[PDB]
Every structure is written in C-alpha cells, then in structure tokens.
Amino acid sequence: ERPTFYRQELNKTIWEVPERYQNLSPVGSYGSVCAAFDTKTGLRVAVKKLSRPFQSIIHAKRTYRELRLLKHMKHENVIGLLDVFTPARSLEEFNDVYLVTHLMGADLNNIVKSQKLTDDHVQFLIYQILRGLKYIHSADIIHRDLKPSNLAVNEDSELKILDFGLVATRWYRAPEIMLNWMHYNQTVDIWSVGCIMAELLTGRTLFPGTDHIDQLKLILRLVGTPGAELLKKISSESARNYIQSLTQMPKMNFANVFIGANPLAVDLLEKMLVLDSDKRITAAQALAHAYFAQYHDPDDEPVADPYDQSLESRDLLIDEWKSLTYDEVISFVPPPL
Ligand SMILES: CCOC(=O)c1c(C)c(C(=O)N2CCN(Cc3ccccc3)CC2)c(C)n1CC
Ligand SMILES: CCCCCCCCO[C@@H]1O[C@H](CO)[C@@H](O)[C@H](O)[C@H]1O
Ligand SMILES: CCCCCCCCO[C@@H]1O[C@H](CO)[C@@H](O)[C@H](O)[C@H]1O
Ligand SMILES: CCCCCCCCO[C@@H]1O[C@H](CO)[C@@H](O)[C@H](O)[C@H]1O
C-alpha cells in the first residue's frame, strides 16, 4: 500500500514525502538535504531530494548512478539507503527522487575542530575509514575525493564515507590527481587517508597549499622528489623532462615531522604517504597494521560484490535512464531494522 504524502516548501523547494517523515529541517544544498524524524523506526534521518533529476540526459545519468551506487553499498562505514521514494504513482508522472539515510549530523571538521585528537580516537576513526575503503575498493570503485567533508560522523565517533558531502579539497588529493594522470590506483584514496590522519594527530593540515603548484611543492618537500624507479614510470615526455629538471630533494623523516606521535602511527603514515602509488599500502593491508590492534577483526571486515560500473556509463536517451531509475525505485527493499 502506497504511503500518504504531504508537501511543504523549504528554501524555495517543494518537498513531498511520506507521512512517515516528520519535522523536516534543511541542513544543506546534486541535491538538497533535510534532517527529519522517521516515525516508523524512531530514527533521525537525512533526506536528499535530487535536483532536476531528469531534465537532461546527464542529470538522468547522474540520478541513475547515484541511486544504483547507494543501493549497492551495504556496509557500516559507507553511506547506504534506508529508503528511496517518489510521490509519482507511475512512470509517466515520475519527476522527483528522494533518498533517505541515517542522520549522522556531523562530518570530520565538526567532530575535530582543528584540535588534536587522542591516539585512541585517531585509531578508531582511521580504522573505520579503512574498513569502509576496503569495502569500496573490493567493489572496484575508487573514491577519488576522500576528504573531511566526505566523512559523516555521529557523536559516538561512528563514521561513514559519503559519495558527496555537504578548507580546500585539494588539500587531501593524491599528487597524481593534481597532475591529471589518467591511470589511477585505488591507493589514491590511501594518500587521502594519510593526509586526514596526519591532521587528526597534529591538529594541523599536512599540505595546505594556497593553490595547485604550492600544494605540489609542499608535497614534494615532505616525500622528496621522484626517485629513479618512479621516473621510469612516467609516460609523458614533457612531464619526465620537467621532473628531471628539478633540484633533487630528500624525503623527510616522518619522526621529525610528527614529534611525539605513536611510533606505530608514524610507521603507518610512511606507508600511506609514498609518492609512487604502486608502493602505497592498500586498505586491507593497513587494517592489519599493528596501529589498529585494539580494533582489527579480520572476521568482521567485509568485502563487496564487484560492481558493474558499465551500466551507468552508457549513452542512453532521457526516457531510457528515467525508466531504469524508476525500476530501481520499485525494486528497493529497505534494510533489516
Ligand atoms: C555542521 C555540519 O553538518 C554536517 O556536516 C552534517 C552531515 C555530515 C550530515 C549527514 O548526516 N550526512 C551528510 C549528507 N548526507 C546526505 C545524503 C546522502 C545520501 C542519501 C541521502 C542523504 C547524509 C549524511 C548532516 C545532517 N549534517 C548536518 C548539516
Ligand atoms: C558511497 C561510496 C562511493 C564512493 C565513490 C563515488 C564517488 C563518485 O565520485 C567519483 O566520480 C568521479 C568523477 O567526478 C570518478 O572519477 C570517480 O571514480 C568516482 O568515484
Ligand atoms: C611531482 C611529480 C610527482 C608526482 C608523481 C605521482 C606518482 C604516483 O605514482 C604513480 O601513480 C600512477 C598514476 O596512478 C601509476 O600509473 C604509477 O604506477 C605510479 O608510479
Ligand atoms: C609534471 C607537471 C609539470 C607541471 C609544470 C609546472 C611548472 C610551474 O612552474 C612553477 O610554478 C610556480 C609559479 O606559478 C612557481 O612556484 C615556480 O617558480 C614556477 O617555476
């Protein structure tokens, strides 16, 4: 049986939602987000109304990708769906899509505040990010924009990685993404984790570049200029030649950079923040690192089904994408709760 819907404007947008969801309150604005109370479960929830989901091919395509991705993500440390709804009663009237998930209420800046965290707390937060990333990476997905705003956290420090979130974003990006390499390893996400971890431990941004080149300079100053093995892996002649033209600079000792940190934390940052992405520690490897001894449970670090990215990278008409998104709404089964 179809739920009864009600409407109300919030910030120039009409939202029509099932009666289930009450006390809609804007928090941010791909789409706009209201906190809300789900009366059926007793849970506070975030409700996201997609923006103009089927007005162009590319909005339709994006809509389908987000819905399908979120339906497939079922893991404690990755954002997933509690509900998906449309007021529409048929394909012909299908114009709006709303996604529901657990309200976390905060992201990593909010909990953190630029103050340094205890080692135990840093351990717990990074452990959860890695646990989520193992899962994402097992599905052959690369996040590529891991940063503090893309990590939702509740007040008990429980964390979920977000597709898109609600402090420069460049600050956490892997060097190869700053230079537009088009082949990427999953360990681009591991670089981002090293950056976040450093910050949590020291209370300061690791690489706070004022712009792109300043950022690459700050990176090279910590990790050193590329060695002989790395230089051999550069396809672009102009890049190769530029890099060789640079004054060699040694890698810094991270003990001198992270004074007084847990030596296990220092050891793990050295394995995350290596310039050559082939040499960076993987999510699964990092989870087994001794830094996480109080949290690591090799029987509770689940892995995903491979994810068919080819279906969302098609070139289809709006009405095809719209109909496919419609079937995903209908086929949705809410999770055990
Ligand atoms: C003070 C800064 O406040 C915050 O950072 C903050 C965060 C991170 C959250 C939160 O829990 N999110 C972020 C947005 N997705 C939307 C969504 C994604 C997918 C499906 C459905 C909805 C849900 C998880 C909230 C409510 N806030 C308060 C605005
Ligand atoms: C919920 C966890 C899913 C994380 C991955 C989804 C984030 C989508 O953001 C990214 O879009 C980029 C283009 O902007 C692509 O290059 C990336 O591979 C893709 O992950
Ligand atoms: C300023 C020059 C230093 C930046 C070099 C970044 C090195 C990243 O490392 C490189 O990642 C590539 C992109 O995914 C991979 O193809 C290579 O195997 C790996 O060596
Ligand atoms: C491998 C990618 C090659 C990128 C070449 C970047 C060259 C930028 O060049 C540098 O940029 C800055 C000025 O904006 C200054 O810090 C330096 O003096 C300047 O030489």
CATH architecture, domain defined by 15-105: 2-Layer Sandwich (3.30)
**C-alpha count within 13 angstroms, C-beta hemisphere, residue 253:** 4
Q: What is the CATH number of domain 106-303?
A: 1.10.510.10
Q: Which of 141, 183, 309 to mutate to test the pocket of ligand 2 (most atoms within 8 A of CB)?
A: 141
| Ligand 2 centroid – CA 132 distance (Å) | 14
H helices of 140-298, in order, are 175-178, 188-202, 212-223, 228-231, 237-244, 254-257, 263-272, 283-287
Amino acid at 32: S
* Alpha carbon distance 111, 121 (integer Å): 11
CA angle 79, 81, 87 (to 5 degrees): 140
Domain ranges of the chain: 15-105, 106-303
| 281 Cβ contact list (under 8 Å, min separation 6) | 187, 190, 268, 271, 272, 289
Of the residues 163, 276, 305, 319, only one is catalytic, namely 163
Resolution reading in Å? 2.1
Backbone φ and ψ of 9, nearest 5° = -85, 140
Q: Report whether residue 99 contacts ligand 2, using a CB cutoff of 6 Å.
A: no
Q: Distances in Å between the alpha carbon of 77 and those of 34, 129, 134, 144, 160? A: 21, 7, 10, 17, 4
Q: Which H or E run includes 43?
A: strand 43-50
Say what angle helices 57-72 and 318-330 make with each other, to 10 degrees. 20
* Alpha carbon distance 21, 23 (integer Å): 7
**What is the rounded (10 degree) CA torsion for 61, 62, 65, 66?**
-150
The answer to whether 15-105 and 106-303 have equal CATH topology is no
| 318 Cβ contact list (under 8 Å, min separation 6) | 54, 56, 57, 60
Encoded tokens for 225: 């200029």
Q: Which H or E run includes 44?
A: strand 43-50
* Alpha carbon distance 268, 198 (integer Å): 10
Are β-strands 106-107 and 151-153 bridged in parallel, bridged antiparallel, or unpaired? antiparallel
Q: Report whether residue 128 contacts ligand 1, using a CB cutoff of 6 Å.
A: no
By the 10 Å C-beta count (0-12 exposed, 13-18 middle, 19+ buried), 265 is classed as: buried
In the residue annotation, 163 being an active-site residue is answered as: yes
